[PDB]
Design a protein around this ligand. Structure first.
Ligand code: ZN
Ligand code: ZN
Lengths: 362, 7
């Protein structure tokens, strides 16, 4: 029979039955499953430092963002994009293709076709759950202990005075695997005193670090996560073969394969310069990048006044509402550019979510 | 900041 996996070390965010204000630090903020009091109750240590207990039966206060640190894996599978084998963590199987699967990183990282609907297969014992397409679903940003975050020592600190003392600060440079069997479970820190080392952020449910300034850790499809209990769209190899004399390849750039970058530079070397939320600048061949997007916060845009097309465009992105009718032809301001490249536009006082093709720059 | 919830 099916049973619950008490996956200690799972990286979680708030769930559908959440009623605990901003204990987590807000929606999208990430925490670590420390332990299970019972099959009904779980204790989480949030990245902000607050440790608390939550429901994981009947009511569900938590969604699983990344189970990979628990080491749970689907032997006999492979992610057809990044070629992780076996898939560790949640398994995502394209329902509309023959024998195609993605890992969590690639799934939330918008690999494969966004209009193809996937099955979620959380555990080896799980029955597959058909989902809405990513393209019509809400995407939000993870926040907490990620590259660029400012941290202090956490509760499970057992590393003497490597940080120069309790309360002394450092910078997370990169999320790494504490071990081969537990990916995305560690954070490499460069302390303010020049010391540097790798620390547990999820491994065996341990929390060696605490945020004092959380960082963005990429975007995810919130409603596709199971309840607990500048862009690159080419193959790694095609990207590598294109970089032969236009920047080159170092593994430290892997982030780029699933992260939105801000084109802040061009250069004399017939190439491009991109910065990422990590804080990393990196150089590229023109063919490796695709725009996404052509708008900036503050840009004034006119809403499309062809109703047929805006209906098509908005429905295609799961954002149509008849209430939007009065906005046709109107000029508004780009308030925010979402991770799925849709635009939060302020128009007629109110704000709406638009397909970027449904507006034109004024 | 250890918090204890009850339900
Ligand atoms: Zn993958
Ligand atoms: Zn497919």
């Amino acid at each position: 029979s099916r049973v619950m996996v008490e996956g200690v070390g799972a990286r979680v965010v708030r769930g559908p039955d959440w009623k605990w204000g901003k204990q987590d630090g807000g929606e999208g903020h990430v925490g670590t499953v420390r332990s299970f009091e019972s099959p009904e109750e779980v204790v989480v240590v949030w990245d902000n430092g607050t440790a608390a207990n939550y429901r994981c039966s009947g009511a569900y206060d938590l969604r699983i963002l990344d189970s990979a640190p628990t080491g749970i894996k689907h032997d006999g599978t492979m992610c057809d994009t990044c070629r992780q084998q076996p898939i560790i963590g949640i398994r995502w199987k394209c329902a509309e293709c023959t024998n195609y699967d993605l890992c969590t990183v690639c799934y939330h990282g918008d690999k494969h076709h966004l209009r193809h609907r996937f099955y979620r297969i959380t555990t080896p014992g799980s029955e597959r759950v058909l989902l809405e397409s990513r393209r019509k679903s809400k995407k939000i940003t993870a926040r907490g202990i990620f590259a660029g975050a400012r941290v202090v020592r956490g509760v499970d600190w057992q590393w003497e005075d490597q940080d120069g003392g309790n309360g002394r600060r450092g910078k997370v440079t990169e999320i790494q695997d504490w071990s081969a069997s537990s990916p995305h479970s560690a954070a490499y820190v460069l302390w303010d005193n020049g010391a540097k080392n790798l620390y547990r952020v999820g491994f065996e449910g341990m929390s060696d670090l605490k945020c004092v300034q959380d960082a963005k850790g990429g975007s995810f499809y919130r409603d596709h996560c199971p309840v607990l209990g500048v862009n690159i769209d080419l193959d790694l190899e095609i990207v590598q073969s294109l970089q032969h004399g236009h920047g080159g390849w170092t593994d430290g750039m892997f982030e780029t394969l699933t992260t939105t970058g801000t084109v802040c530079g061009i250069d004399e070397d017939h190439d491009i310069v991109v910065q990422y939320p990590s804080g990393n600048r990196w150089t590229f061949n023109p063919a490796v990048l695709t725009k996404a997007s052509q708008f900036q916060v503050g840009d004034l845009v006119q809403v499309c006044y062809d109703l047929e097309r805006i209906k098509l465009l908005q429905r295609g992105h799961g954002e149509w509402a008849e209430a939007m009718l009065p906005t046709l032809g109107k000029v508004g301001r780009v308030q925010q550019i979402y991770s799925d490249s849709d635009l939060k536009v302020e128009v007629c006082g109110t704000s709406w979510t638009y397909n970027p093709a449904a507006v034109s720059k004024v | 900041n250890i918090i204890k919830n009850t339900w």
